[PDB]
C-alpha cells in the first residue's frame, strides 16, 4: 500500500504579478469594446511626451508631470516608422505620447489601448509611486463625439464594479484635449467615488502635430476631417482597490510572500 | 566544469488540442466585436434542438440533421432556468438550440457566441465527422438588420485571412431564419472560396417560441419588438484549412504525434 496523502514531488507553481492581472482585465474589458492593445517605449523624446501633445516648455501645464531627464550618447531612439529620432531624452511621464506615435503610423478610424510603465520624480509613500502604470485609450474617426467617451467609461465602470456602478465626469485641464475631463466611478462595495483618470476630445493641435510629422515624413495627412477622444487611467490605484492592497510600494517590492498571494487569480 | 549542452531534467511540456486553438481564435475574433461566449448542453430535448427552432417532425426540413436519439431513465435535463425539462432526448445536431435557451434566460439587446460539440449520424471519411464542433452567433435588439450580419462575417473574414479576403452571401434555407443565407470567405493563400456556414435573420416564430416559453415560466415577454441575426459555422473545416490538416478524423484520433504538432500555437 501507499500513503496517498503524502506531499508529492515539489514541482514549482508559478504566478502573475498583480499589475499584470489588473492590466489584463483592463485590456480584456476594452478588447470587448473593439480596442486593440499596442505599446510604446519607456524612454521617449521631449517631442512625443510633451511638444506634440501641446505641452510646451516653461509653462505651468508642464508642471503636472515631474520629469526624469536622461543623458548618454550612443542610444538610438526609434520613431513611429523606425526612423531614428532625436530630442532631449526622458522617461515618459505618461502613456499619452503613444497617441502621437500610433496616429503617424496608422490611419483612422481605429480604437487602441496602450498600457505601460510610466515614470515621475516624486516621493513614494503608501499611496504614491515614482514608477507606476497607466492605461491609455484613443478612439479616432468621423463623428466621434464626447458622448462616445462617456459611453466607454460607463462600460468600463459596469464591467469593473457591476450594475450598481456609475460614472462621474467633471471638467478638468489637459493640453492635449479640448473638452477636458476627469472621471470617477462609484464603487458600491466600498460606497465611495474613486478618481480613475483624465480624458477628453483630442485637441486640434494634436491632430496637427500628427499630420505635420507625417508630411515631414512623406506620408499624406490623415487627420484633418476626424475627431476623437482619449483617456488615461492609473492602474496601481485600481488594482489596490480591487485586490485590497494597502501599500502601493508592495508592487515593486519583489517580496514573494506578497506576490504569491495572487496565484489564484489565474 | 559542466557540459552545459546536455539535455536537462525531462520536465513535461503540454499543449492544447487544435480545436481548442481554432475555437479560441474564433472566440477572440468575436469578443473583439462585443460577443460573449456561452455554452449549452450536448444532450438536448427535441423541443430545443428542433421544435423551438421551427423544425417540426416528419418534414423535409428535419432531414438536414441526422439525429442520434437517446434512451434511459434517471437522467435529468435542466432547462434555461434550472427548471427540469422533458422531451425526447437526443445529441444536439447543432449549437442553434442555445439560441433559444439563452433568449429565455436573458433580455435584449445582446451578442453571444456559442461554441460546442455537436453530433450527427453519418459515415466518417477524410472530410466528414459524426462528431464535430460548431460556433453559433446570435445578436438581437431593436434595429438589428441583415446589413449587420454581413458586417459581422466581413469582419470575421478580415480577421481570419487578411485584407485580401472577402465574403460571399447566397440565399439558402433554414427554418429558424427568414432571410436565410449561406456564406463563404475568399482564402487568398489558397485562391478559393470555402463555405463557412449558414446564417440569417432570426425567424419570427423563434422569437415567439421564446416568449411563449417565458410566459409558461412566469417571465414577461422580451422579444416582441426586436430583430436579430444568427449564424453557425463548423470549426473542424476552418481548422483543417488553417493548420493544413488533411484528415478530419485526426482530431478525435488521440494520436500524440498529431496533437504534439500544435504546441507551438501557444
Ligand atoms: N504618484 C502616483 N502614484 C500612482 N498613481 C498615480 C500617481 N500620479 C498619478 N497617478 C494616476 O495617474 C492617473 C492619470 O495621471 P495624470 O498625470 O493625472 O494625467 C495624465 O497622466 C494624462 N496623460 C491622462 C490623460 C490621458 C488622455 C486624455 C486626458 C488625460 C490618475 O487618475 C492616477 O490614478
Ligand atoms: N459531417 C460534417 N463534418 C464536419 N463539418 C460538418 C459536417 N456537416 C456540416 N458541417 C459544418 O457545419 C456548418 C453548418 O452546419 P449545417 O447543418 O449545414 O447548418 C447548421 O447546423 C445550422 N444550425 C447553422 C445555422 C445557424 C444559425 C442560422 C442559420 C444556420 C457547415 O458550414 C460545415 O462546415
Best CA proximity match to B83, nearest among B256, B178, B241, B218: B218
Whether the CB-CB separation of B252 and B239 falls below 8 Å is answered with no
Ligand 1 atom nearest to A64, measured from its CA = 17
- Helix (H, G, I), strand (E, B), or coil: what is residue B49? helix
Residues of A within 8 A of B34 (CB-CB) are 32-34
Whether the Cβ atoms of residue A165 and residue A157 lie closer than 8 Å to each other: yes
How far is the alpha carbon of B29 from chain A, nearest alpha carbon, in Å?
A: 10
**CA B87 to each of CA A118, B49, B75, B76, B233: distance values in angstroms, whole numbers, following the listed order:** 60, 11, 12, 11, 27
Chain B interface disruption, residue of A14, A31, A32, A111, most B CBs within 10 A: A32
Given phi > 0 = left and psi -120 to 50 = alpha, else beta, which region is B72?
left
Catalytic residue among A92, A120, A133, A203: A120
What is the full DSSP assignment across chain A?
---TTS-----------HHHHHHHHHHHHHHTTT-EE----SEEEHHHHTGGGT--TTSGGGGGS---B---SS--EE-TTS-EE-S-EEE-SSSTHHHHHHHHHS-SSEEEEEEEEEE--S---TT--SEEEEEEEEEEETT--HHHHHHHHHHHHHHHH-TT--EEEEE---TTEEEEEEEEEEEGGGTEEEEEEEEEEE-HHHHHHHHHHHHTTTPPP--TT-EEEEEEEEHHHHHHHHHT-S-GGGTTT--HHHHGGGGGG-
Alpha-carbon distance of A73 to B219, in angstroms, equals 71
Q: Ligand 1 site: residues with CB under 6 angstroms?
A: A 64, 94, 96, 120, 122, 128-129, 132, 134, 136, 174, 177, 195-200, 230-234, 236-237
Domain parsing of chain B, residue ranges: 1-266
- Euclidean distance between CA atoms B199 and B180, whole angstroms: 6
CA distances from A111 to A95, A175, A225 (A): 15, 21, 17
Distance CA(A187)–CA(A194), nearest Å, equals 7
Distance, in Å, from the CA atom of A215 to the CA atom of A104, rounded to the nearest integer, reads: 10
Comparing CB atoms, the residue among A11, A32, A36 nearest residue B31 is A32
Check: CB of residue B244 under 8 Å from CB of residue B129: no
| DSSP letter (8 states) at residue B159 | H
CA angle, corner A119, sides to A113 and A125, nearest 5? Answer: 115
Taking contacts as CB-CB distances below 8 angstroms, the residues of chain B near A33 are 34
Q: What count of Cα atoms within 13 Å lies in the side-chain half-sphere of residue A216?
A: 11
DSSP string, B99-147: HHHHHHHS-SSEEEEEEEEEE--S---TT--SEEEEEEEEEEETT--HH
B1-266 homologous superfamily: Bira Bifunctional Protein; Domain 2 (3.30.930.10)
- Which-ligand-closest: CA of B97? 2
Burial B1-23 (b: 16+ CB within 10 A, else e): eeeeeeeeeeeeeebeebbebbb
How many other C-beta atoms are found inside a 10 Å radius of the C-beta of residue B215? 11
CB half-sphere exposure, A232, CA atoms < 13 A: 20
Declared resolution, Å? 2.6
Instruction: State how far the Cα of B208 lies from the Cα of B200, in Å rounded to an integer.
Output: 17
Please give the Cα distance from A207 to A211 (Å, whole number): 6
Residue B178 annotated as part of some ligand binding site: yes
**Using the beta-carbon criterion (under 8 Å), do B34 and A33 form an inter-chain contact?**
yes
Q: Give me B128's grid cell.
A: 466528414
Q: For ligand 2, say whether the CB of B197 is within 6 Å of any of its atoms.
A: yes
Cell of B70: 437517446
Write out the three cell numbers for B103: 433568449
Residues in chain B that come right before a backbone break, where C and next N are over 2.5 Å apart: none
Which of A48, A152, A232 should be mutated for ligand 1, with most atoms under 8 A from CB? A232
- Number of A/B CB contacts below 8 angstroms equals 12
Give the residue from chain A lying closest to B9, CA to CA.
Answer: A11
User: Hey, which residues 22-61 in chain B have their CB within 8 Å of chain A?
Assistant: 31-34, 36
Q: Could you give the angle at which helices B146-161 and B18-31 cross, rounded to 10 degrees?
A: 130
Q: How far is CA B179 from CA B43, B200, B201, in A?
A: 29, 5, 6
Q: Which residue has the cell 511621464?
A: A93
Main-chain phi, psi angles of B170, to 5 degrees: -130, 140
Closest CA to B185 of B203, B172, B199, B197: B197
Query: What method did the depositors use to determine the structure?
Result: X-ray
Spatial neighbors of B247 by CB under 8 A, at least 6 apart, are B126
Phi-psi region of B58 (alpha: psi -120 to 50; beta: other; left: phi over 0): left
Backbone angles phi, psi at A101, to 5 degrees: -60, -50
DSSP state of B9: -
| Assigned C-alpha cell, A241 | 482597490
CA dist B101 and B81 (Å) reads 9
Enumerate residues 6+ apart whose C-beta is below 8 A from B27. Answer: B37, B113, B115, B135
Q: How far apart are CA B151 and CA B144, in angstroms?
A: 11
The backbone torsions φ and ψ at residue A254, rounded to the nearest 5 degrees and listed phi first, read 75, 0
Amino acid at each position: 500500500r501507499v500513503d496517498v496523502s503524502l506531499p508529492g514531488a515539489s514541482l514549482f507553481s508559478g504566478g502573475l504579478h498583480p499589475i499584470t492581472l489588473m492590466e489584463r482585465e483592463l485590456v480584456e474589458i476594452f478588447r470587448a469594446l473593439g480596442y486593440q492593445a499596442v505599446e510604446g517605449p519607456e524612454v521617449e523624446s521631449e517631442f512625443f511626451n510633451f511638444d506634440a501633445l501641446n505641452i510646451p516648455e516653461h509653462h505651468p501645464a508642464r508642471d503636472m508631470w515631474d520629469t526624469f531627464w536622461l543623458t548618454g550618447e550612443g542610444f538610438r531612439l526609434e520613431g513611429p516608422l523606425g526612423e531614428e529620432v532625436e530630442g532631449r531624452l526622458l522617461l515618459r511621464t505618461h502613456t499619452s505620447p503613444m497617441q502621437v506615435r500610433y496616429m503617424v503610423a496608422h490611419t483612422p478610424p481605429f480604437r487602441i489601448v496602450v498600457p505601460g510603465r510610466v515614470f515621475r520624480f516624486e516621493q513614494t509613500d503608501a499611496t504614491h509611486e515614482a514608477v507606476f502604470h497607466q492605461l491609455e485609450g484613443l478612439v479616432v474617426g468621423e463623428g466621434i463625439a464626447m458622448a462616445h467617451l462617456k459611453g466607454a467609461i460607463y462600460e468600463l465602470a459596469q464591467a469593473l464594479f457591476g450594475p450598481d456602478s456609475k460614472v462621474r465626469f467633471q471638467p478638468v485641464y489637459f493640453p492635449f484635449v479640448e473638452p477636458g475631463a476627469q472621471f470617477a466611478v462609484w464603487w458600491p462595495e466600498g460606497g465611495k467615488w474613486l478618481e480613475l483618470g483624465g480624458a477628453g476630445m483630442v485637441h486640434p493641435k494634436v491632430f496637427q502635430a500628427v499630420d505635420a510629422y507625417r508630411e515631414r515624413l512623406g506620408l499624406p495627412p490623415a487627420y484633418r476631417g476626424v475627431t476623437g477622444f482619449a483617456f488615461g487611467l492609473g492602474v496601481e490605484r485600481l488594482a489596490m482597490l480591487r485586490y485590497g492592497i494597502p501599500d502601493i510600494r508592495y508592487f515593486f517590492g519583489g517580496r514573494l510572500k506578497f506576490l504569491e498571494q495572487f496565484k489564484g487569480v489565474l
